[PDB]
Amino acid sequence: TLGEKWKNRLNALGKSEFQIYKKSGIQEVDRTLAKEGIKRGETDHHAVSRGSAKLRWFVERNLVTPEGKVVDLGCGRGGWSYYCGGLKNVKEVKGLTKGGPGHEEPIPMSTYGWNLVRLQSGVDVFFTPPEKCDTLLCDIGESSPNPTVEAGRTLRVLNLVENWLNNNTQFCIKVLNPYMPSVIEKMEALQRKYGGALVRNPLSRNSTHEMYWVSNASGNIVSSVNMISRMLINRFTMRHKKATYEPDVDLGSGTRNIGIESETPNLDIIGKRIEKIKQEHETSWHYDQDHPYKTWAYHGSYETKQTGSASSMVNGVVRLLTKPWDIIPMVTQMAMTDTTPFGQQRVFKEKVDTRTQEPKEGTKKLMKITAEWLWKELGKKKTPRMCTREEFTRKVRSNWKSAREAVEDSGFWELVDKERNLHLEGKCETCVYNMMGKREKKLGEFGAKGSRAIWYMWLGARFLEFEALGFLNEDHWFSRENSLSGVEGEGLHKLGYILRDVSKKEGGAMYADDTAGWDTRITLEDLKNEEMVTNHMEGEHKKLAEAIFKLTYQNKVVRVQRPTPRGTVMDIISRRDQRGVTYGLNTFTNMEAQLIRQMEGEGVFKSIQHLTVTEEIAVKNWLVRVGRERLSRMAISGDDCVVKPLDDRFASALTALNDMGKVRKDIQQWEPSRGWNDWTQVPFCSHHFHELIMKDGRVLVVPCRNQDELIGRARISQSLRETACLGKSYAQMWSLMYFHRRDLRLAANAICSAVPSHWVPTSRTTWSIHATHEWMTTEDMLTVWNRVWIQENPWMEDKTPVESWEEIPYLGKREDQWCGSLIGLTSRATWAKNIQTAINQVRSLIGNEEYTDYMPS
Ligand SMILES: Nc1ncnc2c1ncn2[C@@H]1O[C@H](CSCC[C@H](N)C(=O)O)[C@@H](O)[C@H]1O
Ligand SMILES: [Zn+2]
Ligand SMILES: [Zn+2]
C-alpha cells in the first residue's frame, strides 16, 4: 500500500471533519463576487471558475507557456480557455467539454481575447480525433472513494493526451490519481518521452491528490508524489488552518488579433469617404491594434454611445390567457435577441466574418449566360426608369429628427444633390452602411439568443439608391405575373395557393432547401451579374445606377460597434464581397441559381470546371426552349425557394450550387436533398399551408406552422396598456390567418375579450415581407375575414360572404394536433372550461373599461 493510506483515512472520515479538512491550510480564491456578477449578466473581467486562478499559478511560475493553437480538453465553463485567451503568445483556443445534463455547460464571456476562444459542448474528447496544436490542456478526472476506479479513469486520460501530444508541445494535464502503481508506471513512461514533471497546485482542496503533468517542469515522479501524500496526511492532525486567500483573476476586456489581414480593399473608391468619418470625429479616431476582423478590412474606430439590448419581457397579458403552455418549453424558452455591441460582435465573428472561394471558370459562364438571359426576359414587357423625389417624398408615408420632417425641408435635398453629382462624377462620401442587430423573437435561452444584422443606410443615400434601382420593387418586376417565379406583392396567406398551383406541374418532388446565411454568400460574380440591369438602361440613368452598383454595392464602407476595454467604440470596415432593393436582387440571383441547378439535374452541362462550346450552346437552347417553363416551376421570395423540377435527379445536382456560394444549411455538403411529396408539407416563408374545406365546399389554402412558434413569439415584447395592445395585435392576427386552430382562436377570442375594445392594435406582429398586417384595423374581424379570404381572394370563386365564426372551419383535429394543437389534453379542456375566469383577472388589471365578449357559448 502506497501513501493511499490517505484515501483510506479521507473518504472514511467524518462528514464535517471532511468539509473542515478540505479547506484547512490551502489557498482559496474568493469567488463570492465573480459568481455574483456573472448572474447579473456582467460578462467582463470575470473568470468563470476557480480554474482561471489554478492555471494562473502554473502559468505565472513558467511551468506551462501556452502558445499558438491551444486545445483545452474538458473546458467546462471555460476556466483555462478564457484565461488563456488573455495571454500573449496565444493565437487561437479550442474548447471542448462533454457537458450536457449532469455535466458543466460552457459560459459565453466578453473577457479579453474572447474572439480567440471558441467553446464547443457535447464532446466526448475520448472519441474525437487529434488536431495540430501548439499546446494541450486537460482537466478531466472525477474523484471517487474507490482508488482502483480512478486509477482507471486517470489511465484513460493519460492514454488520451498521449494521442494529442507531440515532441514540441506545451502541456498541462490533470493527473487525478497519481499515487497508484498504475499511473506512476504510466507517468514514469510518459515522462521519459515527453518530459516535464508532476506538480501539485496550492489551490486544490485537500480532498484530492490532483497533480499536474506540466511540460516545463522537471522532478522525480515517485518522490514528488509521496511528498504530497506526506503533506496531505499531515494536515489530518494539523489543527484546522484558515485558508490563505488570493484575489481572483481579472481576465480583462476586449478583443485582440491584428495579425492576418486578408481583404485588398480598393481604397481608390472607399477612400474619399473614409476621410469623412475621421474628419467628422478625430477627437476620438484611433487605430485599434486589436481589431477582430479577418475578412473585413479595418480602418480605425471612434467613441460611440452603446446601442442595443438583451431584454425579454413576458407579455403577461397573453401569458395569463396561455395558462396551459407555461409548461411547454418551446414557449417558456423563447427569448428576444441580443443587439448589445457584444452580441453583435459575437454574431459577426461567426456569420459575416467569412469568405467564399471564387467560382470556377465554367460556373462563372453559366451564371453570366443565365443572368444575361433572365435580365433580358424579366424586362421583356418592362422598362427601367428613375424614381422622382416626389415619389420618394411621397413614399415617406410609412416605409432632422424625422424622415417625413427631413424630405419636406430643403436642406436634405441639396445635401443629396452634392453627393448625387459626386456619384455621377465617380465618388461617394456619405454612402456608409451602419450595421445593427435585428431584434427578433428567436427562441434559445436557458434563462440567450442571437442571429441577424440589418445594414441601415443614410436616409439620403437610399434616395440615390431608390432613384436608380427603385423601378424594381415599384414597377413590380418580381411579381409572379412578370417573373413567373417571384411572389412579390403577394399576401402571406395567399402564398399557400401558389404552392398548390405548383404541385399541378408535372415533375418530381417539391424542394425547399435553405441557404446558410444567404447575404454573406453573395459573390462578386453575383454582384457583377446583377449589375447587368444596366445593359438595359441608358443616359443619366445608367451612370447613376452604375455608381450604386460599382460604388456602394461592390465597394461598401460599414460601421459596427464593439466594446473596447475603455468604452464602446464604433469600428469602420469595408468588404467588397457580400451584400447589404436587396430583395429583388436576392430574388434575381436565387432564380438564376435555381435555374443553374435545375439545369444540372437534367444534365444540360456536365462540369462546373469548364463549360464546353457545345455545352454553353445547350445552355442557351435550354434557356430559350424551356426557360420560362422552369421559372413556372419555382416559388421564390428572396433567398427562400421552393422548386419542383422534372425529375428527382435534382436532389444531387450540387457542384454548381456549392460553387456559387449558395451552400445549404444543416446538412453535409455532398448529401442529397430532402424531397417533399405533399405540398402541404413544404415550408416557404416560415409557414406551411393546409387545404381546408368549409361547409359550402370551397377550397381554402391557409397558412400554418408549429403552433408553439406562434404562442412563444406572442408572449414576448421589446405599461399594462402598451403590452395589452401588443397581444391584441397578435390576437387579431391569429384570427384572419390562423383561424383554423382550435387553440389559437379560442385564445384569441380571449385576448380581445380582455383587452378593452376601441384600443387600437400596435407595433409589428411580424417582420415578414409578405405580411399584409391587415389585422391592425379596429373593425369587426369577420368583416376583414370576408375581405381577405372571400371578397378579395382570387382563388376564391364563390364570393358568397360568410356571416358567423361558426360557419368558419378548423383544421381536422389530428392536423391541429400534428401542427401542434393541445386539444385532447386535460389541461387544454380545463383551460377552456374555466376561461372567463382568466379573462376576468386580466380585465381586473387592465383597469375598468368597455369590454365586448367574443367567447362562443
Ligand atoms: N470525456 C469527456 N470529454 C470532454 N469533457 C469531459 C469529459 N469528461 C468530463 N468532461 C468535462 O471536463 C470538465 C473538467 S472539470 C472542468 C474544469 C475546467 N477545465 C477549468 O479550467 O475550470 C468537466 O466539467 C466535465 O464536464
Ligand atoms: Zn455616395
Ligand atoms: Zn399546418
Author numbering: 8 to 406, 419 to 466, 468 to 600, 605 to 742, 747 to 885
Give me lines lifted from the publication on this model.
Being a unique natural fusion of an N-terminal methyltransferase (MTase) and a C-terminal RNA-dependent RNA polymerase (RdRP), the NS5 is the largest and most conserved protein encoded by flaviviruses. The NS5 MTase catalyzes the guanylyltransfer and both the guanine N7 and nucleoside 2′-O methylation steps in the capping process, and is a single-domain module adopting a common S-adenosyl-L-methionine (SAM)-dependent MTase fold. The RdRP module is the central molecular machine governing the viral genome replication, and has an encircled human right hand architecture with palm, fingers, and thumb domains surrounding the active site. In this work, we report two crystal forms of DENV2 NS5 that reveal two conformational states bearing clear analogies to those observed in the JEV-mode and DENV3-mode NS5 structures, respectively.
With an aim to further understand the conformational diversity of NS5 and related functional relevance, we crystallized and solved the structures of DENV2 NS5 in two different crystal forms at 3.1 Å (form 1) and 2.9 Å (form 2) resolution. Each structure has two NS5 molecules in the crystallographic asymmetric unit, and has the two molecules arranged in a dimer through pseudo two-fold symmetries with highly consistent global conformation (root mean square (RMS) deviation values for superimposable C-α atoms are 0.74 Å and 0.57 Å, respectively; chain A as the reference). The DENV2 form 1 conformation is clearly related to the JEV-mode conformation with the JEV interface partially opened through a pure 20° rotation along an axis passing the vicinity of the highly conserved GTR residues that were proposed to pivot the MTase movement relative to RdRP. The partial opening of the interface results in the reduction of the interface area to only about 900 Å2 or 59% of the JEV interface. Among the six conserved hydrophobic residues forming the interface core in the JEV structure, only three of them (DENV2 NS5 residues W121, F349, and P583) remained as part of the interface. The tip of the ring finger no longer contacts the MTase in the DENV2 form 1 structure, and its electron density becomes weak but still readily traceable and its folding is largely consistent with the JEV conformation. However, the motif G region in the pinky finger is largely disordered as observed in the DENV3 structures. Based on these observations, we propose that the interactions between the MTase residues 113 and 115 and the phenylalanine (residue 465 in DENV2 NS5) in the tip of the RdRP ring finger are essential for maintaining the canonical folding of the ring and pinky fingers, and the folding of the motif G region in the pinky finger is likely dependent on the dynamics of the adjacent ring finger.
